[PDB]
Amino acid sequence: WEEWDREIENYT
Amino acid sequence: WEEWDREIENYT
Amino acid sequence: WEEWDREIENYT
Amino acid sequence: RMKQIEDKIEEIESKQKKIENEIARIKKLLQLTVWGIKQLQARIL
Amino acid sequence: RMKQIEDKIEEIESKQKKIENEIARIKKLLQLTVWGIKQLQARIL
Amino acid sequence: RMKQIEDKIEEIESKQKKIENEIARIKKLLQLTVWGIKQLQARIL
Ligand SMILES: [Cl-]
């Protein structure tokens, strides 16, 4: 879920 | 969560 | 939730 | 120069249709993730 | 031929504004589904 | 009149690339919210 969360702010 | 829900139909 | 899930891969 | 400019526009128009269709699918796709978000809330809170 | 090509572009530009505004709303709409996803996680896990 | 119409199109093309790149990011961003939605379901229901 960290990858999920890192990726969230990453693609946003 | 109402702001969340008001905003949902608002931006959609 | 199957319709939901069928539709997910459907529109993606 | 005229003709090639008309060909540029055909392309642009072509790519724009692609864009609009993709966006249509993105909006419905978002409708579905909204349902699921709200559904999970009901069960849980 | 010139004029009609300028009219084609007005349309294209017009449709492009529509596209950009819709995308703005899609991004905020996605911001909101992210909040809800993360919120439900806190309560539950 | 020709040249300025070619400059209009460069802009249009430029804005269209921006649009396509943003959409790419929106689709992946949606892929991620889907995962999270489905993940929360497993834990809970
Ligand atoms: Cl466009």
Side-chain angles (χ1 to χ4, degrees), chain D residues 2, chain E residues 1-8 10, chain F residues 1 5:
Chain D
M2 270 295 304
Chain E
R1 209 189 179 161
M2 270 295 304
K3 182 59 158 289
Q4 283 302 217
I5 281 178
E6 303 180 319
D7 296 328
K8 288 169 73 171
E10 287 192 9
Chain F
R1 209 189 179 161
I5 281 178

Side-chain angles (χ1 to χ4, degrees), chain F residues 10-21:
Chain F
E10 287 192 9
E11 276 279 353
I12 294 174
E13 287 177 345
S14 211
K15 191 111 70 181
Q16 198 163 68
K17 295 152 59 249
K18 183 61 196 180
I19 289 180
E20 309 175 271
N21 294 326

Side-chain angles (χ1 to χ4, degrees), chain F residues 9-35:
Chain F
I9 297 164
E10 287 192 9
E11 276 279 353
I12 294 174
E13 287 177 345
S14 211
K15 191 111 70 181
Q16 198 163 68
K17 295 152 59 249
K18 183 61 196 180
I19 289 180
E20 309 175 271
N21 294 326
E22 186 56 25
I23 286 183
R25 287 185 283 267
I26 287 174
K27 292 160 61 57
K28 207 295 181 293
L29 210 52
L30 199 50
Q31 286 185 55
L32 297 178
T33 73
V34 166
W35 186 78

Side-chain angles (χ1 to χ4, degrees), chain D residues 12 15-16 19, chain E residues 12 15-16 19, chain F residues 12 15-16 19:
Chain D
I12 294 174
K15 191 111 70 181
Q16 198 163 68
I19 289 180
Chain E
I12 294 174
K15 191 111 70 181
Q16 198 163 68
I19 289 180
Chain F
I12 294 174
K15 191 111 70 181
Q16 198 163 68
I19 289 180

Side-chain angles (χ1 to χ4, degrees), chain E residues 16-29:
Chain E
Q16 198 163 68
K17 295 152 59 249
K18 183 61 196 180
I19 289 180
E20 309 175 271
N21 294 326
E22 186 56 25
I23 286 183
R25 287 185 283 267
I26 287 174
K27 292 160 61 57
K28 207 295 181 293
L29 210 52

Side-chain angles (χ1 to χ4, degrees), chain D residues 22-40:
Chain D
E22 186 56 25
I23 286 183
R25 287 185 283 267
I26 287 174
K27 292 160 61 57
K28 207 295 181 293
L29 210 52
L30 199 50
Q31 286 185 55
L32 297 178
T33 73
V34 166
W35 186 78
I37 292 175
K38 294 166 63 292
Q39 254 284 38
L40 282 182

